[PDB]
Design a protein around this motif. Structure first.
Motif, PDB file in Angstrom:
ATOM      1  N   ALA A   1       0.855  -1.179   0.000  1.00  0.00           N
ATOM      2  CA  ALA A   1       0.000   0.000   0.000  1.00  0.00           C
ATOM      3  C   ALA A   1       0.893   1.232   0.000  1.00  0.00           C
ATOM      4  O   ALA A   1       2.119   1.140  -0.078  1.00  0.00           O
ATOM      5  N   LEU A   2       0.266   2.394   0.094  1.00  0.00           N
ATOM      6  CA  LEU A   2       0.981   3.651  -0.024  1.00  0.00           C
ATOM      7  C   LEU A   2       1.087   4.353   1.322  1.00  0.00           C
ATOM      8  O   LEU A   2       1.427   5.537   1.375  1.00  0.00           O
ATOM      9  N   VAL A   3       0.775   3.640   2.410  1.00  0.00           N
ATOM     10  CA  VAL A   3       0.855   4.135   3.779  1.00  0.00           C
ATOM     11  C   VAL A   3       1.555   3.073   4.618  1.00  0.00           C
ATOM     12  O   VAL A   3       1.533   1.884   4.284  1.00  0.00           O
ATOM     13  N   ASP A   4       2.202   3.523   5.703  1.00  0.00           N
ATOM     14  CA  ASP A   4       2.983   2.688   6.611  1.00  0.00           C
ATOM     15  C   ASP A   4       2.208   1.476   7.113  1.00  0.00           C
ATOM     16  O   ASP A   4       2.565   0.332   6.797  1.00  0.00           O
ATOM     17  N   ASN A   5       1.170   1.711   7.926  1.00  0.00           N
ATOM     18  CA  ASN A   5       0.278   0.631   8.341  1.00  0.00           C
ATOM     19  C   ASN A   5      -1.099   0.855   7.739  1.00  0.00           C
ATOM     20  O   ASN A   5      -1.811   1.790   8.151  1.00  0.00           O
ATOM     21  N   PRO A   6      -1.514   0.025   6.789  1.00  0.00           N
ATOM     22  CA  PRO A   6      -2.784   0.239   6.097  1.00  0.00           C
ATOM     23  C   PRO A   6      -3.951  -0.492   6.752  1.00  0.00           C
ATOM     24  O   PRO A   6      -3.788  -1.469   7.486  1.00  0.00           O
ATOM     25  N   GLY A   7      -5.151   0.011   6.461  1.00  0.00           N
ATOM     26  CA  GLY A   7      -6.349  -0.681   6.872  1.00  0.00           C
ATOM     27  C   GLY A   7      -6.652  -1.895   6.011  1.00  0.00           C
ATOM     28  O   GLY A   7      -6.166  -2.056   4.884  1.00  0.00           O
ATOM     29  N   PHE A   8      -7.485  -2.778   6.555  1.00  0.00           N
ATOM     30  CA  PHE A   8      -7.904  -3.971   5.832  1.00  0.00           C
ATOM     31  C   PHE A   8      -9.421  -4.070   5.866  1.00  0.00           C
ATOM     32  O   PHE A   8     -10.061  -3.561   6.785  1.00  0.00           O
ATOM     33  N   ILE A   9      -9.993  -4.704   4.843  1.00  0.00           N
ATOM     34  CA  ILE A   9     -11.386  -5.129   4.858  1.00  0.00           C
ATOM     35  C   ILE A   9     -11.401  -6.638   4.674  1.00  0.00           C
ATOM     36  O   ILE A   9     -11.052  -7.148   3.597  1.00  0.00           O
ATOM     37  N   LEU A  10     -11.777  -7.356   5.730  1.00  0.00           N
ATOM     38  CA  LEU A  10     -11.846  -8.807   5.662  1.00  0.00           C
ATOM     39  C   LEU A  10     -13.265  -9.220   5.311  1.00  0.00           C
ATOM     40  O   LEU A  10     -14.223  -8.488   5.577  1.00  0.00           O
ATOM     41  N   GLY A  11     -13.388 -10.386   4.677  1.00  0.00           N
ATOM     42  CA  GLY A  11     -14.666 -10.857   4.183  1.00  0.00           C
ATOM     43  C   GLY A  11     -14.770 -12.355   4.325  1.00  0.00           C
ATOM     44  O   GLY A  11     -13.876 -13.071   3.878  1.00  0.00           O
ATOM     45  N   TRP A  12     -15.823 -12.854   4.965  1.00  0.00           N
ATOM     46  CA  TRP A  12     -16.007 -14.289   5.154  1.00  0.00           C
ATOM     47  C   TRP A  12     -17.134 -14.765   4.252  1.00  0.00           C
ATOM     48  O   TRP A  12     -18.262 -14.278   4.352  1.00  0.00           O
ATOM     49  N   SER A  13     -16.811 -15.692   3.357  1.00  0.00           N
ATOM     50  CA  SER A  13     -17.770 -16.274   2.433  1.00  0.00           C
ATOM     51  C   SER A  13     -18.237 -17.626   2.952  1.00  0.00           C
ATOM     52  O   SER A  13     -17.425 -18.511   3.247  1.00  0.00           O
TER      53      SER A  13
ATOM     54  N   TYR B   1     -14.751 -19.453   2.255  1.00  0.00           N
ATOM     55  CA  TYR B   1     -13.369 -19.004   2.181  1.00  0.00           C
ATOM     56  C   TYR B   1     -13.269 -17.618   2.809  1.00  0.00           C
ATOM     57  O   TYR B   1     -14.253 -17.068   3.308  1.00  0.00           O
ATOM     58  N   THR B   2     -12.070 -17.040   2.781  1.00  0.00           N
ATOM     59  CA  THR B   2     -11.814 -15.758   3.427  1.00  0.00           C
ATOM     60  C   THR B   2     -11.113 -14.813   2.460  1.00  0.00           C
ATOM     61  O   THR B   2     -10.294 -15.244   1.654  1.00  0.00           O
ATOM     62  N   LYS B   3     -11.422 -13.526   2.548  1.00  0.00           N
ATOM     63  CA  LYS B   3     -10.891 -12.513   1.649  1.00  0.00           C
ATOM     64  C   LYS B   3     -10.240 -11.409   2.470  1.00  0.00           C
ATOM     65  O   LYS B   3     -10.881 -10.828   3.351  1.00  0.00           O
ATOM     66  N   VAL B   4      -8.983 -11.103   2.164  1.00  0.00           N
ATOM     67  CA  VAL B   4      -8.263  -9.988   2.766  1.00  0.00           C
ATOM     68  C   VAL B   4      -8.074  -8.924   1.692  1.00  0.00           C
ATOM     69  O   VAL B   4      -7.467  -9.193   0.645  1.00  0.00           O
ATOM     70  N   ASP B   5      -8.627  -7.731   1.928  1.00  0.00           N
ATOM     71  CA  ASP B   5      -8.442  -6.593   1.036  1.00  0.00           C
ATOM     72  C   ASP B   5      -7.639  -5.530   1.756  1.00  0.00           C
ATOM     73  O   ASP B   5      -7.967  -5.173   2.888  1.00  0.00           O
ATOM     74  N   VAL B   6      -6.594  -5.026   1.103  1.00  0.00           N
ATOM     75  CA  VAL B   6      -5.740  -3.991   1.675  1.00  0.00           C
ATOM     76  C   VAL B   6      -6.206  -2.629   1.162  1.00  0.00           C
ATOM     77  O   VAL B   6      -6.502  -2.465  -0.030  1.00  0.00           O
ATOM     78  N   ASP B   7      -6.316  -1.666   2.076  1.00  0.00           N
ATOM     79  CA  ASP B   7      -6.675  -0.291   1.745  1.00  0.00           C
ATOM     80  C   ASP B   7      -5.442   0.391   1.180  1.00  0.00           C
ATOM     81  O   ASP B   7      -4.682   1.027   1.905  1.00  0.00           O
ATOM     82  N   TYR B   8      -5.281   0.302  -0.143  1.00  0.00           N
ATOM     83  CA  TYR B   8      -4.019   0.657  -0.802  1.00  0.00           C
ATOM     84  C   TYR B   8      -3.687   2.142  -0.665  1.00  0.00           C
ATOM     85  O   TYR B   8      -2.514   2.503  -0.507  1.00  0.00           O
ATOM     86  N   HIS B   9      -4.688   3.019  -0.729  1.00  0.00           N
ATOM     87  CA  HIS B   9      -4.445   4.437  -0.507  1.00  0.00           C
ATOM     88  C   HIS B   9      -4.609   4.843   0.954  1.00  0.00           C
ATOM     89  O   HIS B   9      -4.402   6.017   1.284  1.00  0.00           O
TER      90      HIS B   9
END
Length: 291
Positions: free
Chosen positions: A254-266, A276-284
């Motif tokens: 990502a473009l920041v030191d410690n970024p946020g995440f959005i996790l998702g459980w299917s 399954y599980t989804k990890v999304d990184v808050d890139y900006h």
């Protein structure tokens, strides 16, 4: 464009580090047409463990600028990246945009197969009944009483999935039951899906998104997905991640030191496909602090 090139490099490196199947032709065709939006907008890189030792890789952007709603679908048309192939979903984005006020656009891409889904977000909330006019699958309306009883009727977003010809309806968690673990225990039981761990159930009361996956093949509700924000690496329940997704939490670009995440459980039918599980990184770094 310095920003664009870096993003491209990150994505290909995630795919490579985590065993995801890339295609450079497809990614280059994608970025030629969409890279500038990836730089200007809320943008996420997602990995997910539908597979045992490979993690899968995806990436997605959302445009909240009014002046530019609809541009995503147009760009996807003219580029030829999204082709009207008369699948039952191919009529849905026009209908949605004809029927409801849009307040946000978005495209999701698969790193091997290209453009995969397009998302739309209604202005307010609307009763799901208002979408039955649309060409959704039959099991949306044939599961309208289910959706009422479980208080999954305050519809606000559509996600049209061309790779699987499915539709994800996003519901707002307006009811007191939504802030309780028994609600989710009950809902997954009722759908005859894979039970959640007690840890997950503890987490689900925090206010996040709920999406149901309706299918044009099936008369049934196919998958279900819970989505929860996390401020940073340390707020992430890493216990709920296989070794490879834990790694992805630490190494996520990502473009920041410690970024946020959005996790998702299917979740899906018990002992079938869909859990399954989804990890999304808050890139900006500025999608997750959106309340």
């Amino acid at each position: 464009m310095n920003d664009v090139n870096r993003i491209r490099t990150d994505i290909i490196n995630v795919a490579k580090t985590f065993g995801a199947e890339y295609s450079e032709k497809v990614l280059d065709e994608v970025f030629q047409v969409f890279g500038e939006q990836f730089a200007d907008n809320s943008f996420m890189i997602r990995t997910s463990n539908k597979q045992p030792d490979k993690l899968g890789c995806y990436f997605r952007y959302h445009e909240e600028d009014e002046s530019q709603l609809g541009l995503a679908w147009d760009i996807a048309r003219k580029s030829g990246l999204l082709s009207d192939q008369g699948r039952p979903v191919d009529q849905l984005i026009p209908e949605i945009c004809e029927t409801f006020p849009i307040m946000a656009d978005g495209v999701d891409f698969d790193v091997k197969h290209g453009l995969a889904k397009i998302w739309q977000s209604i202005k307010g909330v609307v009763p799901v009944q208002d979408a039955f006019k649309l060409s959704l699958p039959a099991s949306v309306t044939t599961h309208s009483d289910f959706l009422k009883n479980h208080h999954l009727d305050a519809l606000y977003a559509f996600g049209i999935d061309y790779h699987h010809s499915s539709v994800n309806l996003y519901f707002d968690t307006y009811h007191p039951k939504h802030h309780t673990s028994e609600y989710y225990k009950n809902l997954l039981q009722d759908l005859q899906f894979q039970p959640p761990s007690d840890e997950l159930l503890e987490l689900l009361t925090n206010n996040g998104e709920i999406a149901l996956t309706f299918n044009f093949a099936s008369p049934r509700i196919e998958r279900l997905c819970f989505y929860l924000p996390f401020l940073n690496r340390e707020a992430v329940p890493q216990n709920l991640l296989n070794p490879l997704l834990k790694k992805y939490i630490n190494e996520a670009p990502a473009l920041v030191d410690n970024p946020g995440f959005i996790l998702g459980w299917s979740f899906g039918p018990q002992g079938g496909k869909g859990t399954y599980t989804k990890v999304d990184v808050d890139y900006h770094g500025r999608t997750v602090p959106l309340f």
